Amino acid sequence: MGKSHKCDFTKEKYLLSGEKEVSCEIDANPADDITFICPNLCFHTVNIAKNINQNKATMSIQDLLYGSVVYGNTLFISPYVRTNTPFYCFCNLDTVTIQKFLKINRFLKDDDELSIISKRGIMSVFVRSNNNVIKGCDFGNNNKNYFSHPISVAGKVNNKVCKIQGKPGELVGFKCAFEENGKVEPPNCFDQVLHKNKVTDLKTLIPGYASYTNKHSSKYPYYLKIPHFVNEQYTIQCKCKSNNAQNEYTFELDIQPGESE
Ligand SMILES: [Cl-]
Ligand SMILES: [Cl-]
Ligand SMILES: [Zn+2]
Ligand SMILES: [Zn+2]
Ligand SMILES: [Zn+2]
């Protein structure tokens, strides 16, 4: 968990601007989240540079910020960032788009909280680095040591079962080997998990928990934020599924009881 940032290019501060480039800029820490609302490629892929002319190159967010998770219009920045990283997302605010959303925004009759020139909107994100590796398992074959238990490091994963221990308040997770049609078991992990060999609603064990997951595949890591109070010890499981038997792994988590302060 961290601060939630937002870049909403549907707002008039962008639409009715005079400039041909309008800017939204974010200074983010690891485990922050960013929501990007564009009225017209990211977060799954992002731009390396702000200038259109040079460094037109783009990169997968997992290659740039390994350990990060994309779900919908939101990015959960990896709990571990190795290097200060800038990246950029662009929004084409053409005159048709602007006219459309100026009409859409008329639905707002007042400024209650929610509980013309063509432009190029730019979201500039700056991500600070940190030192702590992610408490969890990496089942992908690589030497990136972003997680405390990579399969590369001997003794970390035995018999294809990675045993992690989590205390109250801690963030833990795992990352399946990358592929375009891998799945997790149970499908809705962490909201459902394996407990005592049966599928179990995690809310019935550790209510108050939080999770960061992509629900469409096992492309991205799975994260669990253990609540500040855990009444008793629980051992739960999630599993990486794949037609490839080399990518079949078990994430086993020993959740300890307590009250953190
Ligand atoms: Cl998505
Ligand atoms: Cl999702
Ligand atoms: Zn999604
Ligand atoms: Zn009102
Ligand atoms: Zn709390």
Numbering used by the authors: 19 to 58, 63 to 137, 224 to 369
Copy text verbatim from the article accompanying this structure deposition.
The complex P. falciparum life cycle is supported by a diverse repertoire of surface proteins including the family of 6-Cys s48/45 antigens. Pf12, Pf38, Pf41 and Pf92 are localized on the surface of the blood-stage merozoite, which is the form of the parasite that invades erythrocytes, proliferates, and causes the symptoms of malaria. On the merozoite surface, Pf12 and Pf41 are displayed as a heterodimer with Pf12 tethered to the outer membrane via a glycophosphatidylinositol (GPI) anchor and soluble Pf41 appropriately localized through its interaction with Pf12. Collectively, these data establish the architectural organization of Pf41 and define an essential role for the Pf41 ID in promoting assembly of the Pf12-Pf41 heterodimeric complex.
To compensate for this innate property of Pf41, surface lysines were chemically methylated during purification, and crystals of methylated Pf41 were observed after eight months. Ultimately, the structure of Pf41 was determined by zinc single-wavelength anomalous dispersion to a resolution of 2.45 Å. One Pf41 molecule was present in the asymmetric unit, and PISA analysis indicated that Pf41 crystallized as a monomer consistent with a previous analysis showing no homo-multimerization capabilities. The refined model of Pf41 begins at Lys21 and extends through Glu369, with a four residue disordered region (Lys59 to Ser62) and an extended, un-modelled region between Ser137 and Ile224 (left). Two of the dimethylated lysines were located at a crystal packing interface (right), underscoring the importance of lysine methylation in obtaining diffraction quality crystals of Pf41. Structural analysis confirms that both Pf41 6-Cys domains (D1 and D2) adopt a β-sandwich fold with expected disulfide connectivity of C1-C2, C3-C6 and C4-C5; the first two disulfides pin together the two sheets of the β-sandwich and the latter disulfide anchors an ancillary loop to the domain core. Intriguingly, despite a rotation of D1 relative to D2, the relative spatial positioning of the two 6-Cys domains of Pf41 is analogous to that of Pf12, with overall dimensions for these two domains of approximately 65 by 40 Å, despite the prediction that the 6-Cys domains of Pf41 are separated by a large spacer. Strikingly, structural analysis revealed that the additional residues in Pf41 map to three distinct regions: a large inserted domain-like region (ID) of 108 residues (Thr117 to Ile225) between the β8 and β9 strands of the D1 core that is largely proteolyzed in the final structure, the D1 β9 strand, and the short inter-domain linker. Analysis of the crystal packing revealed insufficient room in the crystal lattice to accommodate the un-modelled residues leading us to conclude that the region was proteolyzed during the extended time frame in which it took the crystals to form.
